[PDB]
Write a protein that binds this DNA or RNA. Sequence first.
RNA 1: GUGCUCGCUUCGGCAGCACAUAUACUAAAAUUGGAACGAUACAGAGAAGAUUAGCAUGGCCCCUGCGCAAGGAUGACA
Length: 48
Amino acid sequence: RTVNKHGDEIITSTTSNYETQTFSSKTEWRVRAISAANLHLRTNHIYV
RNA sequence: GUGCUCGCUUCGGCAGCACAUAUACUAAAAUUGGAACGAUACAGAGAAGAUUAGCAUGGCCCCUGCGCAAGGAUGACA
């Protein structure tokens, strides 16, 4: 959802890969699930 | 149409007479076609040589070896 040169609030479909870098840090379902993997191996040192 | 004829003829009318003499792309309407360098989309270094590494050839000067041609000076008793 962009604006044109005159600011007309249009919707465009672009293909130039220049603002496409995904962030995906510390708050994603995929990243969170990958962190949850091997969580069973983290239950050894039970600090009571 | 206006006005007039000593006309027919009546004021209800008629016949003739003078003037009027040739506008308009004419158009209100009919329809189906072909259409940007305007936007968004892409690209965007939108002005450079379009290169530098060796060796061999070619020119000049020596040195050495071999060949060809023509030569110079010298050496050897029993």
